[PDB]
Design a protein around this ligand. Structure first.
Ligand SMILES: [Zn+2]
Lengths: 375, 98, 147, 47
């Protein structure tokens, strides 16, 4: 998971919110450097940075295009980069670093650090849930959207279903990002482009003989009556001239941002929305189970790489927007690398990922259990 | 567990093309009744299109991972009794060997 | 139970069935809205026999209901009883008939009485499955006898 | 019990009633298209 980080990922995370009114190109990372006052710079080592309470980190340079050093990366032990990977028995012994070792730790300000595996509800998947007895909504289908490698937009979607079994008007409404209320799926489907029902129902039903679901959709379709075009369809997302743009925007950048936030794919997005309102009614009609949440295949484990990613990102961006600070003074080389390294250190040695701000998860980087090999 | 490992993360591209060059009706131009029991196709949680005769698709991709052409990690299922094909190139899925 | 009747295996049910809150909704397989303008004949074959019998203003908007047959013996009832109820429930502003515990298909039909009908009939579609009772007192669900 | 929509603008249909002929009369409320009963069967429930 660390290999994968340095190899490919590190290149990526320096290319996205890169350039400015100056570009960042290719990437150079070194084997452990240790840099001290009184002496050149030593080919740092496990033993050494351990006994001397240093950081087993190393060099992070990027080809600046108008080649440049910015910070150090606490390299993982026994990785690709670590002097140790290649070595063998006799050498290990000779280095004093143990043979029977297995690797994996980091070595910040001396001690042996380890990162805590992070279980999480596998992002980007459709799910369907019932609500409690007293509740406006009987059912809701949710989807968390999160760009896999950029801005980690965790904007999300509740697709509801008012009125408990029986009560009149099983009206359907869904909730968007940057959006005050809950739009009845009609307006949405129409602002998306696909304007007439019967067609709307083609996105939603894959069998014209499902008189059941068909039926259900009716009161909603009747909800939307009061607007029929892709103009007022976005006008009533106003929360003039302005609002009809506010919306258009919000629908190509904030709506189901995973899939595509680009442009001409209303066809694809609406069809997904379709499949969602479908799934919702699959369960409103006890046809398929409320989605099992403690399903292991449905959860992912944030490891080294990904942690280094979140971190390296929300960190470096704080630098990118420092560049503009030293530049906008240019009424006419100041790339303070201390932040990039003292950050990695900070969060690593402590456990507070979201910088220093206690509003980050204090728990990761439990410091290696050295009691017995088993442990 | 001992055998278990974490998924690293593969690229979606050369599998997306590897698929649309096999039967991928782009979600763009779908025909609700024309394509009746259309086994719809997903990836990382995204609807990339639809394919006819699924069994073929499957046996194909299977002895395609079994040679290496597709990362032997990334996984995908056909939910028979739902005519769906979920594809997962994700990073975070625990897996074992069999 | 009561002082004397203590080993009264039937007295048991005699009271089970005097509280075990039964509602219309417990016996109703389906509710259909038909359009029958003729105040004297259903456009349905199965619903003919019971027409010409309940003869021996309204509205052309018909409301038909089916009652599960087993749902008439886990709470031992009768189409007649139910009719009695609905009748005493809305009372005078709707005409209604019902087949017979006989007929292989248990069926109730109900019209209206004196601008937008098939939006009113609906209000009174739920107004009946959930707000109408048969026997028993509020809250009391599953109710079983024990020795 | 399957239902339908209008040609012209393919939108949903809402029933009406011929006051003189006593017929079922599905009509559109976006344009003017109308039509007759395929069946007096309007809405079924089933639980
Ligand atoms: Zn029309």
């Amino acid at each position: 998971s660390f290999n994968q980080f340095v190899d490919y990922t590190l290149q990526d995370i320096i290319c996205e919110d890169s350039t400015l009114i100056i570009s960042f190109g290719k990437i150079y990372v070194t084997k452990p450097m240790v840099n001290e006052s009184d002496g050149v710079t030593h080919a740092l080592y496990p033993q050494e940075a351990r006994l001397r309470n240093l950081t087993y980190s190393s060099g992070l340079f990027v080809d600046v295009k108008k080649k440049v050093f910015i910070g150090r990366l606490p390299i993982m032990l026994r990785s690709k980069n670590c002097y140790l990977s290649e070595a063998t028995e006799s050498d290990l012994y000779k280095l004093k670093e143990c043979p029977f070792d297995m690797g994996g730790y980091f070595i910040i300000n001396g001690s042996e650090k380890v990162l805590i595996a992070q279980e999480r509800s596998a992002g980007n998947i459709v799910q369907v849930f019932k609500k409690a007895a007293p509740s406006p909504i009987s059912h809701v289908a949710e989807i968390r959207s999160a760009l896999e490698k950029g801005s980690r937009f965790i904007s999300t979607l509740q697709v509801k279903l008012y009125g408990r079994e029986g009560s009149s008007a099983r009206t359907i409404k869904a909730t968007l990002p940057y959006i005050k209320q809950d739009i009845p799926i009609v307006i949405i489907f129409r602002a998306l482009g696909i304007i007439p029902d019967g067609e709307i129902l083609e996105h939603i039903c894959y069998d014209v003989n499902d008189w059941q679901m068909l039926e259900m959709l009716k009161p909603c379709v009747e909800d939307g009556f009061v607007i029929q075009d892709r103009e007022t369809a976005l006008d009533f997302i106003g929360r003039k001239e302005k609002r009809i743009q506010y919306a258009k925007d919000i629908l190509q950048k904030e709506f189901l941002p995973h899939i595509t936030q680009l442009e001409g794919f209303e066809s694809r997005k609406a069809f997904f929305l379709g499949y969602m309102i479908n799934r919702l009614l699959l369960c409103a009609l006890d046809r398929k189970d409320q989605d099992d949440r403690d399903h292991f295949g449905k959860k992912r484990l944030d490891l080294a790489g990904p942690l280094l990613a979140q971190l390296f990102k929300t960190l470096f961006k704080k630098l990118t927007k420092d560049i503009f600070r030293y530049m906008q003074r240019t009424v006419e080389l100041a790339i303070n690398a201390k932040t990039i390294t003292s950050g990695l250190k900070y969060a690593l040695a402590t456990g507070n990922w979201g910088e220093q701000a206690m509003s980050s998860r204090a728990g990761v980087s439990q410091v290696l259990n050295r009691y017995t090999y088993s442990s | 567990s001992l055998m278990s490992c974490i998924s690293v993360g593969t690229d979606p591209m050369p599998i997306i093309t590897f698929l649309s060059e096999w039967g991928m009706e782009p979600l763009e131009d779908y025909v609700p009744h024309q394509s009746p029991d259309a086994t719809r196709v997903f990836v990382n949680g995204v609807w990339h299109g639809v394919h006819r005769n699924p069994a073929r698709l499957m046996e194909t991709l299977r002895t395609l991972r079994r040679k290496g052409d597709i990362n032997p990690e990334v996984s995908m299922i056909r939910d028979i009794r739902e005519k769906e094909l979920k594809i997962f190139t994700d990073a975070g899925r625990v897996y074992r060997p069999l | 139970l009561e002082p004397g009747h203590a080993a009264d295996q039937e007295q048991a049910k005699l009271i089970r069935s005097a509280i075990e809150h039964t509602t219309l909704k417990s016996v109703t397989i389906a509710s259909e809205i038909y359009y029958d303008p003729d105040p004297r004949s259903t456009v349905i074959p199965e619903d003919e026999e019971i027409i010409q019998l309940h003869f021996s203003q309204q509205s052309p908007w018909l409301l038909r209901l089916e009652l599960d047959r087993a749902a008439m013996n886990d709470k031992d009832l009768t189409m007649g009883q139910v009719g009695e109820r609905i009748k005493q429930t809305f009372k005078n502003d709707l005409f209604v008939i019902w087949s017979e515990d006989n007929d292989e298909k248990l069926i109730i039909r109900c019209r209206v009485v004196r601008a937008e009908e098939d939006h009113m009939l609906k209000k009174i579609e739920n107004t009946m499955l959930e707000n109408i009772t048969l026997r028993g007192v509020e809250n009391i669900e599953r109710v079983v006898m024990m020795k | 019990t399957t239902f339908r929509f209008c040609r012209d603008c393919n939108n949903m249909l809402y029933p009406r009633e011929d006051k003189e002929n006593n017929r079922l009369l599905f009509e559109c409320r976006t344009c003017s298209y109308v039509e007759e009963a395929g069946s007096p069967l309007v809405y079924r429930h089933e639980l």
